[PDB]
């Protein structure tokens, strides 16, 4: 289940994204609720620091912006 993919405290953000999209592609879900999973669930399950950073970015941030913003962790 996509809801069980949570970024570990040691894990780089790119690896967490990779697992999140791998599990996301097998999930049985509409494309809009997949958009909600990419846009909101991905941010909600990030580790504390990168989650703070991702929420600070506000709405509509692309995956490239999200990946660049968290590279300091």
């Amino acid at each position: 289940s996509i809801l069980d993919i949570r970024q570990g405290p040691k894990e780089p953000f790119r690896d967490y994204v990779d697992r999140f999209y791998k599990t996301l592609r097998a999930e049985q879900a509409s494309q809009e609720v997949k958009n909600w999973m990419t846009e909101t669930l991905l941010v909600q399950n990030a580790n504390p620091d990168c989650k703070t950073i991702l929420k600070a970015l506000g709405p509509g941030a692309t995956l490239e912006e999200m990946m660049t913003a968290c590279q300091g962790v």
Partner: nanobody, 113 residues
């Protein structure tokens, strides 16, 4: 990492203001900075965003009127506000992204007669 906003104050409708966010250390090391605001009784709303290497993104309520810029010479983050409305009254916060997200304490912006 320390941040401090400034440039806020009291203005009439239709006026202009320029907020500035001072950062300790070098500002070019941050991977993202931006602006949020909070009005009395209302939840924090996103204002502006800058991600390193990317174009500025602005909220829809401000896109025509606000601009966000970064000055590496003074190590400061500027938000230029024009065509101000009373609904723009809020406390404005800058944020910076490094190993975590850091926030300033905010600066008050008040638009009124």
């Amino acid at each position: 990492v320390q941040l401090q906003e400034s440039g806020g104050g009291l203005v009439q409708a239709g006026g202009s203001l320029r907020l500035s966010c001072a950062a300790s250390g070098s500002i070019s090391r941050f991977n993202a900075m931006g602006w949020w605001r909070q009005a009395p009784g209302k939840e924090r709303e996103f204002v502006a965003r800058i991600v390193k290497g990317f174009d500025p993104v602005l909220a829809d309520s401000v896109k025509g009127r606000f601009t966000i810029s970064i000055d590496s010479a003074e190590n400061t983050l500027a938000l230029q506000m024009n065509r101000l409305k009373p609904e723009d009254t809020a406390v404005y916060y800058c944020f910076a992204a490094l190993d975590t997200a850091y926030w300033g304490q905010g600066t008050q912006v008040t638009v009124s007669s």
